[PDB]
């Protein structure tokens, strides 16, 4: 069921000159993200944190401090260029966790192997009044 690709260190990363928008202490102590793509040729692309970098012909692996920054770079790579990307989340443990695209197909394309999470079978106008859930820990929408 779509064994996710395993992160391959020794994959080169784009030619960058350095920036003050890179990683910080949060990447040291809690987590950071890593995105990979494959680059038909060596080109210039705008970095989601600073200026411009040069993606190498062949595997490109970039480490960002925010998942949102990764998805932004992924969107730019995917529609301005035509490049398929995947990103992971790395903990200070040395664990990696394949993040996107979760089940091999982009989420804008329906896949028959996904379950419904957080779906309510009613229209939004049929939530109970807050008075109905007073003094119980539940929220009227979580129902």
């Amino acid at each position: 069921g779509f064994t996710p690709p395993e992160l391959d260190p020794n994959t080169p990363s784009p030619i960058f000159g350095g920036s003050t928008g890179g990683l910080l202490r949060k990447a040291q102590v809690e987590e950071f993200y890593v995105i990979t793509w494959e680059s038909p040729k060596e080109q210039i692309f705008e970095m989601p944190t600073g200026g411009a970098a040069i993606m190498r012909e062949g595997p490109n692996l970039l480490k960002l401090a925010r998942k949102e920054q990764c998805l932004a770079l992924g969107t730019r790579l995917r529609s301005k260029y035509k490049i398929k990307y995947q990103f992971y989340r790395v903990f200070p443990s040395g664990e990696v966790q394949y993040l996107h695209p979760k089940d091999g197909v982009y989420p804008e394309k329906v896949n028959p192997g996904r379950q419904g999470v957080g779906v309510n079978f009613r229209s939004i106008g049929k939530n109970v009044s807050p008075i109905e859930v007073k003094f119980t820990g539940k929220q009227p929408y979580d129902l």
């Binding site: 939004i124 106008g125 939530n127 009044s129 807050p130 929220q139 009227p140 929408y141």
Partner: protein
Amino acid sequence: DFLVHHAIALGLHTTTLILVKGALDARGSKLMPDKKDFGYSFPCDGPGRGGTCDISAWDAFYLAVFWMLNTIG
């Protein structure tokens, strides 16, 4: 005295307009029909549907305190 008493009347009416509008619109309006399940005080409902800055009832109170200060002034 006449002119300033009518200034007072305007102050009272506008403050009560703000507060009553905040109270009667607390459970929801046409711009946000499901306001009641968001609580009494919240930021806004994002920039969609034209923008919903200061849509709480807390925001109505917040706006009415200015008019209260002005009228008591």
